[PDB]
Each structure stands twice: as C-alpha cells, then as structure tokens.
Amino acid sequence: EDSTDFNDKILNEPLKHSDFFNVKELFSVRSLFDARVHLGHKAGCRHRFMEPYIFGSRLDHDIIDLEQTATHLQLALNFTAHMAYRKGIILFISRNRQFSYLIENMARDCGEYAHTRYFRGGMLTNARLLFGPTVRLPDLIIFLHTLNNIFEPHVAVRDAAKMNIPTVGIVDTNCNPCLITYPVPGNDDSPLAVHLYCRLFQTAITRAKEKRQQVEALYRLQGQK
Amino acid sequence: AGSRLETVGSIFSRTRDLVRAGVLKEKPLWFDVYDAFPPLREPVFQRPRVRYGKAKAPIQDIWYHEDRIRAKFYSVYGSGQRAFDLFNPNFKSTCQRFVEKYTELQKLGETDEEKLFVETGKALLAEGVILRRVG
Amino acid sequence: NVESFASMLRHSPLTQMGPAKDKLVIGRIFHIVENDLYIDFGGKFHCVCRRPEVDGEKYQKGTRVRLRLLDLELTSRFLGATTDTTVLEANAVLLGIQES
C-alpha cells in the first residue's frame, strides 16, 4: 500500500522521463573537443570493434567521432544518475597510475567507492569468501581505464559481466567494448579528458543524490499533509 | 542462483530469462534503468579475429583541399619561425595564414596554380610576414 | 548554427599543424621527477626530457618551453606481435625556454 505508493512516486517516476536529471547541459561537443576527447592511438594500435566509433585516421592517428561520443556519454551519464538516485553502490575502477589520486578524491567527494590499486583475484567472483558472507556487491562499476598496465583488457569488466554488474566504461581506440554495457568512445590518456570525465560523473551523482533527498522529503511532507 | 556465463548473451538477457523462469526471486536494482534506457548496442561477447585475404579496415584517412597547400608550404619556405601554440583554440600559424591567403586568391579566381602560389607569397611579403626559404 | 565536429576538426590547430616532424611548438612543464621534465603540449601524450646542464634551475613547474616535436606517439611493431607496442609518450627535443 504505502510502500507501493512510495516506490511509484519516487522510483518509477524518473523512468517515465527521457532526461529526469538534466544531464544534457553538463557536456557539449565543443567541451569534448576542448578536452581532447577525439584524440586516439595510432592506426597500428587500433583494435577491432572500435572501427564504428572511430571517425577516421589523421596522419597515423585515430580520430573518434564526437557525435557518437556525445550520445554514448549522454546514455552513460543518465544510467549513472539513475543508479545514484536508486541508492546504488558505484565503484570507479582504473589501473592507471597517473590519475589514481584524482579518482580517489572524486570518490570521496561524491560519496562513492574507488579501486585504483592492484586488483587481487576474486574481489567480485569470490567476494563473500574475502570481505564476508554478508558483503554487498556494487550495483554499478565505472571504468575510466579499461586497460591494465600490460595494454590488455582489465579483469574487472569480465568479473562484472560474470556477476551481472552493469559497467560504464571509457574506451579508447585500443580497447575491447564487447563486454562493457555503456562504452563511451573517448580519450583515456589526456589529463584534461580524465578531469572532464571525473567532473561530469561527480556532478551527475551529486545531483541524483540531492534530487532523491528532495523528492523523498517532498513525498513525506505531502503524506503528512 | 544467477548465471556466470558471460559469453552466453548479455547480462540483461540472462537476468530477464532467469526472472521469467523464476530462478531470480528479485530483479536487480539496475534492471529497471536498463529497460527504460537501453544502450545503443547490446553488450554481447564477440571474439576478435584477424583480417585475412584482401579485407581492409573501413577506417579512411582524413584529407582536405588545403593539405596540398600546407605540404607545399612545408616543403618550400620551410616551417615558420613562430612556434605552434596548440593550447590556444584560435592559434594561426604562418603556414595556415599562407593557406588562407591562397584560398582567398583562389576565391578571386586566378587560374594558374604557380601564379596563385607566387601571388600568395607576394601578399605575405606585402603584409610583412617573414618568408625564409630553406633553399 | 552549432559548430559541427567536422568543422572543429578541420579548423583545429593540431590538424592544420600537418606532420609533427621537425615542428616548433610550445610546451608547459607540469611534473619534475629527478631532473626529468614532463613537458606537456597540445597533444594526446606528454614528452619527457632531461633538465639542461646550462642554467637548468629555471626549469620548474609551469615553465613554458620551446620544443621540436619528432613524433606524437612512439609506437612500433616487433617480431611476433599482433599490435604495435607503445610507450604512451611523445618524442621531442628541448630547444629552450619561451620568452615573451
């Protein structure tokens, strides 16, 4: 009764709107271009399954179609905002050693979790035997660098696919987006691009949590009166 | 129970079938969001394979009409003294300025390409742009 | 009315630069580790140089310097590999310090 009404007016309401959290204003094509998102690796480093996302090659350097990047980023931010709205656990995973400090700071500010260190085997497929029998697995994993330090796909995406955990991942011109739920074709090496991604995701999570509190407080006030 | 077969369908397809069969008593938190806003491509594991035979990558090079002008100015008159400032979105190098003047004279309608190149050099000399040929 | 991605790419300074070989650019130092200047320019990757032996003390963080780029990214395909091994860095020569 009351619980069903609570769920309908709070959880099911944003699902009826195309952009309930208004993430379109966060980013634009020119903003991505100024952040060097379109840049990619060499044509010899190009990986299969990224050709549709690659706009072309400019002097043995791949260029990513920012039109597709904007659409994929819009879907990824919308999914991230809804998960944050639903009190979901968001984990930022990145094996890059240049932005580990920045990503951990982002997790602290947004209230979510991060994993920028060596990924020990069994952190997801065998989490109960390590953390504890009643551990709660993350409801969403965001990859800022899907490749490990040996230029190969990370094991976390495969583990997340095994555990049915949706993944939002930044994929460059040498990544494998086959098992990534929301691939965002962009640049994972430019500091400006990484900072832009952190700010956009942090803003989306923060807005979602604030709007969840506002809607819940309004619903309680309406219930009282 | 769940399913850990990451190579058999997507996470959504496996979850939907398990819920339909009743194996999963409760749907996950992300199920409703995924259904409402599905991604452009459903994530399904596909093995990459090598392109044998005459197959070639569909990725094509990026070229423009002004690339001929840039190559010619990089060969004759060499690189400009001004250092490229790629931080500035509105940076204009000597080669780019030569290209713009060449394009403007082309818009005027000069026929000879050699005369067009010479006139572009004359315009830069009139404007005061330093033109130090390598040879 | 809205600028298209093709228009942005066509008029981008990196596109009109042409080949990166023997081109003078301006970089900015953002990280120093044991006489290693991690200079950053308007590219995908940074370039690591050594502090000059002559008046190298002025090379600090935020200093703008002049570089002669040789390659935007050092990738090479070796024997038996199916892809080009990359160092995730560019190649450049530290000419001096930009002065206004």
Binding site: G56, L59 | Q60, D61, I62, W63, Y64, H65, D67, R68, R70, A71, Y74 | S4, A6, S7, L9, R10, G18, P19
Partner: peptide
C-alpha cells in the same frame, strides 16, 4: 550538405622514395 567533411586524396605530405647513391648512373 557540409563542405567540411574529409575528401578522398592521396597523401600530399608523402616524401619521395629514397634512391641509392648509384641510382640512374651506369
């Protein structure tokens, strides 16, 4: 449509093929 789309061209920056010191000499 749009005139800013890349066109199909051969590489204009391509350097000429290198020749040996005895090329063209009997």
């Amino acid at each position: 449509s749009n005139e800013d789309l890349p066109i199909s061209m051969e590489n204009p920056y391509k350097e000429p093929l290198k020749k040996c010191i005895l090329c063209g000499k009997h």
